[PDB]
């Protein structure tokens, strides 16, 4: 039993946009932009909507890059995260009460201040690879076990 989420990386040839989450799940970490998919909404439409809500950016073309399932031991619901990439956006990043977006050069990605799984799958994202992953966490800082494989079809 899993709940759908989206995650969007605005990845340009020389930088990536991340947002410092100020509240809720993952507050205090840099992350891509995303959230829960709504009833009657497609996953891609949810990804576009969340990118706007959290970053202020409008995306047209979204590319599927991965699917990652997160398990937190002691929590019944799995997070089924559909990851997307875009290099084509409109607008300028907006800081709000919920999120502080900032651009990072690719060699300065702040892995120590990101979810630990990102250290595994971001290198694949940066090399334009697609993937399926599963990360089992104990709390929010420890990966107990994981699987990650490259795929041709997300
Ligand atoms: C659990 N791992 C994970 N969670 C995320 C991420 N970004 C937002 N949230 C809530 C991420 O990259 N990994």
DSSP the chain: -EEEEEEEEEEETTEEEEEEE-SSTTTTSEE-B--BPPTT--HHHHHHHHHHHHH--EES--EEEEEEEEEETT-SPEEEEEEEEES-EES-----SSEEEEEE-GGG--GGGB-TTHHHHHHHHHTT-EEEEEEEEETTTEEEEEEEEEES--
Decide: 70 in ligand 1 pocket, CB within 6 A. yes
* Domain with 11 in it: 1-154
Q: How far apart are CA 101 and CA 131, in angstroms?
A: 25
Method: X-ray
**Taking every pair of C-alpha atoms in the chain, what is the biggest distance, in angstroms?**
41
Distance 61 CA to ligand 1 centre (A): 22
CATH assignment of the domain containing 44: 3.90.79.10
Q: How far apart are CA 71 and CA 138, in angstroms?
A: 9
CB atoms within 10 A of CB 23: 10
Q: How far apart are CA 144 and CA 27, in angstroms?
A: 21
Q: How far apart are CA 5 and CA 74, in angstroms?
A: 19
Q: 24 in the Ramachandran plot: left (φ > 0), alpha (ψ -120 to 50) or beta?
A: left
Closest CA to 5 of 67, 95, 61, 87: 67
Contact 6, 47 (CB under 8 A): yes
Closest CA to 96 of 16, 45, 20, 11: 20
Q: Please indicate if the annotation marks 137 as binding a ligand.
A: no
Mutate to test the pocket of ligand 1, among 4, 11, 24, 31 (most ligand atoms within 8 A of CB): 31
Closest CA to 68 of 141, 140, 136: 136
Structurally, the chain folds into a number of domains equal to 1
Q: 134 in the Ramachandran plot: left (φ > 0), alpha (ψ -120 to 50) or beta?
A: beta
Q: How far apart are CA 90 and CA 75, in angstroms?
A: 38
Contact 62, 47 (CB under 8 A): yes
Vertex 126 angle, CA 4 and 81, to 5°: 5
Resolution (A): 1.2
Decide: 26 in ligand 1 pocket, CB within 6 A. yes
């Amino acid at each position: 039993a899993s709940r759908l989420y989206t995650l969007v990386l605005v990845l340009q040839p020389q930088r990536v946009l991340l947002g410092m989450k100020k509240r809720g799940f993952g507050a205090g970490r840099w992350n891509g932009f995303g959230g829960k998919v709504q009833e009657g909404e497609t996953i891609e439409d949810g990804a576009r909507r969340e990118l706007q809500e959290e970053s202020g950016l409008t995306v047209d073309a979204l590319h599927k890059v991965g699917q990652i399932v997160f398990e937190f031991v002691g929590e019944p619901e799995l997070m089924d995260v559909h990851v997307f990439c875009t290099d084509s956006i409109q607008g300028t990043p907006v800081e709000s009460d919920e999120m502080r977006p900032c651009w990072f050069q690719l060699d300065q990605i702040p892995f120590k201040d990101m979810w630990p799984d990102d250290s595994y799958w971001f290198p694949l994202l940066l090399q334009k690879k697609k993937f399926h992953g599963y990360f089992k966490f104990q709390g929010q800082d420890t990966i107990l076990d994981y699987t990650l494989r490259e795929v041709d079809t997300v």
